[PDB]
Amino acid sequence: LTPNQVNDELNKMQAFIRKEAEEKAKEIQLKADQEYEIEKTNIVRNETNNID
Amino acid sequence: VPPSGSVIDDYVRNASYLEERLIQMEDATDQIEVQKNDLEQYRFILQSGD
Amino acid sequence: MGATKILMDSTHFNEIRSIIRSRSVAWDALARSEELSEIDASTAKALESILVKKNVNGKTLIPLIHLLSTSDNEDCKKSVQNLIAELLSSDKYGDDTVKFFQEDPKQLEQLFDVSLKGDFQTVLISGFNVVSLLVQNGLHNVKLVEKLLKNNNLINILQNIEQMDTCYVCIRLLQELAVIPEYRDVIWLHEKKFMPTLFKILQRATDSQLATRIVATNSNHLGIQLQYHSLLLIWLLTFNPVFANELVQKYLSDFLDLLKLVKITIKEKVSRLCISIILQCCSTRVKQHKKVIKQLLLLGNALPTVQSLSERKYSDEELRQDISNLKEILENEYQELTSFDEYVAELDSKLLCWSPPHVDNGFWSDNIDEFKKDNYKIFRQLIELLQAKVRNGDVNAKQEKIIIQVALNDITHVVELLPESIDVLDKTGGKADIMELLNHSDSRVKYEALKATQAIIGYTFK
């Protein structure tokens, strides 16, 4: 009814959506670093097998 | 009606797990009742005919 | 400047920083009282105007560290560490303070020695400032992370579950420090102390229902951020192959509630890290993945939660790809084994248990011809194991009930499969205990023995 409750609810909903978006956003690079390290280790072993 | 949140998988598994045993219990009860009624129906006929 | 804002935009750090920002500290009165130097009080008093007036921390960085190391007050060190931590994280005031910390490691090593003393809020402020410069590529000190993890004040402050800011900042500091691959070994060595606090926060959030809103966390961002920080901290340590097998083999009982935590929770943050932790632990790169997948699938029941969770997907594609990727390896993991080696290994091991391939009639029909080598000596050995377990080790027990139920289900499927196995049960003598086992307790096992007796009773009269 009042605009203060809708402004506080939208202000909390926007900050919660932004914090959930960033906190859900960090895991992509957080897993992508270990995936890139695993791919680099697999390529390094794949080259080291033929090198040996 | 519960005042908490909605769970479709937990409510579906508790009903499918009960219905899956209830169908086999009803079919086994009907087959055991038909076999017991057939053997009990034929036992007095065999004993009377003997 | 341009430092990372990890552990700086949360309300828990701003709530503890607001209490130190509410009070005022006079460096001139403390320096005049023989408690500090005049240059450190003048630089500390002049350093406050650089924050609001700017928006040089590198020039005044040495007097604040020397005054903080020489001083023994928690209010002055908490205010100077809060002002230096607030000026370091900003990108428009005090840019030279961040370069001076990465350039000289003696200021970070001397600043890390002042942590853990006084109040618990100063240890999080100094640990956040040392963890901010330690997380960069300029300085990598594993001795500060191992020494901070070996401290009793940090484990005592993080062990307190009554404060969301202390456990959230302490778990967020170890979670941010665990992102580096070199700190995973030192953080993994002392993970046994902070390991129960991550599962206790997930059990406390899982214990809260949906009708009422708990004060710590039930659907709030504080409990979801603490449980997401604990699941992200366990997910960071779960990236190692030996750490996932050792942690899954050691803490599988406390880690078994992660499937119920993602099912009871509605957000994809805790369910995504919970399904991603089980999917990463169930990978083929980890050693002994069949035992962890069999113990986690049998004890944890990840197959029904993954199958029901596959239909009710989330908005994120990583959760559906992780649940769909883990469901194929979890479903194909039990189906990939042979039924004759699993039935001969389970019957030879004297331990009966349920499985996905043990409730199928095709396994007993396929192994029925191979088991028949001594006039059905395999089924007579299984019926002699079930009846010998029924005689020695009587019913109404926990151990004999699982082997009696699995032996009654496998004996009911093997007896219902072929009509020639009924002579082995009457010749051995286990058919008499099957009728008496139905009238006892454990009515599920009495229904399995009722189906096993109905299968042999069906072939007698048609």
Degrees to nearest 5, angle at CA C348 with C346 and C350: 70
Q: Is residue C324 assigned to a domain?
A: yes
Closest CA to C322 of C336, C302, C295, C294: C302
Give me the number of domains chain C comprises. 2
- For residue C145 the two structure tokens come to 């992370």
Q: Is residue C4 assigned to a domain?
A: no
Same domain, C238 and C292: yes
Q: Is residue C318 assigned to a domain?
A: yes
Same domain, C310 and C376: no
Same domain, C411 and C266: no
Cβ density class C413-437: b for 16+ within 10 Å, e for less: bbbbbbeebbebbeebebbebbeeb
Q: State how far the Cα of C153 lies from the Cα of C62, in Å rounded to an integer.
A: 26
Same domain, C283 and C316: yes
Interface of C with B (CB under 8 A): 209-211, 263, 266, 304-305, 308-309, 311-312, 447, 450-451, 454, 457-458, 461
Q: Is residue C305 assigned to a domain?
A: yes
Of the candidates C309, C325, C340, which is a domain's last residue? C340
Q: Is residue C1 assigned to a domain?
A: no
Same domain, C75 and C222: yes
Find, in chain B, the residue whose alpha carbon is nearest to that of C211.
Answer: B4
Degrees to nearest 5, angle at CA C159 with C157 and C162: 85
Question: How far does Cα C115 stand from its chain's mean position?
Answer: 28
Distance (Å) from the alpha carbon of C56 to chain B's nearest alpha carbon: 54
Of the candidates C320, C340, C360, which is a domain's last residue? C340
Same domain, C255 and C355: no
Tokens 């960071």 belong to residue: C236
Q: State how far the Cα of C276 lies from the Cα of C316, in Å rounded to an integer.
A: 13
CB contact under 8 A, C308 and B21: no
Q: State how far the Cα of C43 lies from the Cα of C61, in Å rounded to an integer.
A: 9
A9 touches chain C (CB under 8 A): no
- For residue C309 the two structure tokens come to 């969770």
Q: Is residue C28 assigned to a domain?
A: yes
DSSP-assigned letters across all residues of C356-417: SSTT-HHHHHHHHHHH-SSSSHHHHHHHHHHHHHHHSS-SS-SHHHHHHHHHHHHHHHHHHH
Which CATH number fits the domain that encloses residue C407?
Answer: 1.25.40.150
Of the candidates C307, C340, C373, which is a domain's last residue? C340
The parent domain of residue C395 ranges over: 341-460
Same domain, C18 and C98: yes
Closest CA to C350 of C415, C395, C269, C404: C404
Alpha helices in C180-301 (DSSP H): 183-189, 195-207, 221-237, 241-250, 258-264, 268-281, 289-299
Smallest Cβ distance to C447: which of B5, B7, B25? B25
Q: Is residue C132 assigned to a domain?
A: yes
Long-range contacts, C381-387 (Cβ 8 Å, 24+): C381/C347, C382/C347, C382/C407, C382/C410, C382/C411, C383/C407, C383/C411, C383/C424, C383/C425, C383/C428, C383/C430, C384/C428, C384/C430, C385/C347, C385/C350, C386/C411, C386/C430, C386/C433, C387/C428, C387/C429, C387/C430, C387/C433
Which CATH number fits the domain that encloses residue C73?
Answer: 1.25.10.10
Closest CA to C453 of C402, C412, C421: C412
Distance (Å) from the alpha carbon of C393 to chain A's nearest alpha carbon: 50
List CB contacts of C380: < 8 A, sequence separation 6 or more. Answer: C374, C424, C427, C428
Same domain, C297 and C380: no
Closest CA to C269 of C325, C344, C217: C217
Tokens 């390290």 belong to residue: A37
Same domain, C330 and C383: no
B and A adjacent (3 or more CB pairs under 8 angstroms): no
First to last CA, chain A: 75
Q: Is residue C3 assigned to a domain?
A: no
Question: How far does Cα C26 stand from its chain's mean position?
Answer: 45
Q: State how far the Cα of A30 lies from the Cα of C393, in Å rounded to an integer.
A: 52
Contact (CB, 8 A) for C51 and C94: yes
Give the dihedral of Cα atoms C301, C240, A27, C291; nearest 10 deg.
-10
CB contact under 8 A, B9 and C308: yes
Same domain, C103 and C149: yes
Same domain, C315 and C407: no
A and C adjacent (3 or more CB pairs under 8 angstroms): yes
Q: State how far the Cα of C77 lies from the Cα of C27, in Å rounded to an integer.
A: 11
Same domain, C347 and C335: no
DSSP-assigned letters across all residues of C280-319: HHTSSSSTTHHHHHHHHHHHS-HHHHHHHHHHS--S-HHH
